[PDB]
Amino acid sequence: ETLLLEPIEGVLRITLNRPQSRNAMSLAMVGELRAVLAAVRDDRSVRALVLRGADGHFCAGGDIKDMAGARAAGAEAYRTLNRAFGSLLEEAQAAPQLLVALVEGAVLGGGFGLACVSDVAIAAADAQFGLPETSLGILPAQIAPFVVRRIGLTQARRLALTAARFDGREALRLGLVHFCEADADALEQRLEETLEQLRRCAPNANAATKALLLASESGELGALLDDAARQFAEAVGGAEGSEGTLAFVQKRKPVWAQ
Amino acid sequence: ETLLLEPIEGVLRITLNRPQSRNAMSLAMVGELRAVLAAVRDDRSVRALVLRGADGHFCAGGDIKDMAGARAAGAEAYRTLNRAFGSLLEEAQAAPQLLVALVEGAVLGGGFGLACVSDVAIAAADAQFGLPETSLGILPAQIAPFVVRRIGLTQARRLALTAARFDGREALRLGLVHFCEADADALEQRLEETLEQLRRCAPNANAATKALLLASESGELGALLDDAARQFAEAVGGAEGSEGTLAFVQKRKPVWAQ
Amino acid sequence: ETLLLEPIEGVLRITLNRPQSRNAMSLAMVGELRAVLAAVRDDRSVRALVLRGADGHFCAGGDIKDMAGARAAGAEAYRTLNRAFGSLLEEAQAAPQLLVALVEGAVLGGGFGLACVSDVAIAAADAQFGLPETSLGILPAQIAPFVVRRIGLTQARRLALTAARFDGREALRLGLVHFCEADADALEQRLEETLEQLRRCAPNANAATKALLLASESGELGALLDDAARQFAEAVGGAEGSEGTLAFVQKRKPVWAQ
């Protein structure tokens, strides 16, 4: 495998583990990230995924050798390979779980895309972010809509057309990540606090809320509200909602937060 | 009512007034707010709305007594009453008036909802914002589209899926509110400043302008511009754009600014 | 002619030159800026455009001699000329070139609009921005969708409906421009730093990326990704890209960067 899975309680830790290449995205880790996501998709015991790069780097891009190797197969193999990386962005973005990305060192090209589809991104102040693609003659093609949705067209355009590079303090200022920490100790503390907040929140409740936020663009407003109101009733009447509102009234923690 | 109405000239102040429950939205209060908004919707003598909470809290969420009462009527009651709270947000968001929110203390759940549909929000630094909904097994269902519109998916996903509390200074940073003041004299000065800026501005112009902006979120650009051009022509030549452009070439205030 | 044009290698400078009306957008200027854009649209040797205003002023808005005289002509004249200014905004927004704006002095109404469609805006701390339209009884009708996209509904609704004015530093905090500097020597220096980052990026790659970016904001995700992935294979297969990947794997700069 190219990942290292450490399932603890309802938190699944996923480390990108090719430190030689700064955990660059080989073709297979795309396959292997997509299958883990697919494996936990319906699993409400899996409450949160934590995404980290091994050895001080999140992800420096798509793997050099594999992409070199790909020419032998031709441009139609680049399409469906590219699109399959697109599908990882869709499936990671739509993951019912809370996706925390812990980002240090290099966060470039497709590593940057991956950061764009997290619910929570925690950055090391000296991490370096960027979209090299066009200086290399090529396209941040699958990332494009996800960076727009991340930081807004105004910052995405500049970053993509000038290949500008920047640190975690700047990725924070640009609304690309939620937190920026000085060193490792403070990353983890930030990470553990984030996981304690998450523990307060119900997993079916989180999944449906998420789907609503994601859908809230598409998307005529009135119809979205009609449907949201149905989903709200369903949640109130289900096992999670009755426990959670009962817990509130009885001034206790709900089951999932014990 | 559950409200106190204060109409000073062109400014209708509206105070949520159930201080006992930190001004929780009751079924009655949503009804009254909707009735008031429809009352003035077509009235251009009413140029601004100020939305405020009695006793140092803005609004703490849905009223628990009413949520408790609805279980007796089942899923259909939860749906119909949640959707009507969605109708309040729609009709406040789309009000022809400038809607100013002065938010103090608790700004939670449906409370955080109303803040998200103001043209101008001014918060107390010690205000506490949050979406507790999924920490209770339910959904900020009607809120979802208005919060993603408010601050973007990237911030909304974190607030919603972690039930994070945070203060006024943070709410300014995240783009949730437009000003954060440290005390009540400051909060009030900002309010009256905003209101004097607003009185420069004509009411039919503001109204037309606010609809276009709201339509910009989802409207195909070409056809939106088409319509916008017709509206511009109808503004310049109406009995407001002519007074306005006149006051300008003359060296005086247009009448609405008197 | 209302414009000075100075090409140099890949960059084309365009200076708004009616310094006497604060370079106010006359009917003639609009037609001229449109023709330019159109001549260079398909020309990939023009890699960037730079917009600037003459005599320390960017653009104070719509020329008032031209706007007052248009009243002889009636509603349709205003409609047609307004829609024309929108088309300008459309055509600039969609320029396959990297569009840079340097912004000084007045940036009001119309001028505010051209800034909202640049890829990189660089502002003078002393620049004053604003949307005075409703204070004049009229609408920033064609601006409305571009500023919503620029800075988001939450900020655009307060600027437009209070005719609030703000400086270069504020315009940066609001995300309206990317860079702010205290003096022209610095505005200047930022421009060339910006242009150097760009020369690293290949012009066909940048045109295709910008198109993707522009089509994300509301263009269905799945279809978009399908097509982007086709495009990705072609960039990787073409002249740019094959050269870029090489120069990267090799020690050197690609040709467009030399």
From TrEMBL, chains A, B, C:
Listed GO biological process terms: terpene catabolic process
Family statement: Belongs to the enoyl-CoA hydratase/isomerase family.
Matching SUPFAM superfamilies: ClpP/crotonase
Pfam families assigned: ECH_1
Protein known as: Isohexenylglutaconyl-CoA hydratase
Superkingdom field: Bacteria
Molecular function, one GO term: methylglutaconyl-CoA hydratase activity
Gene: atuE
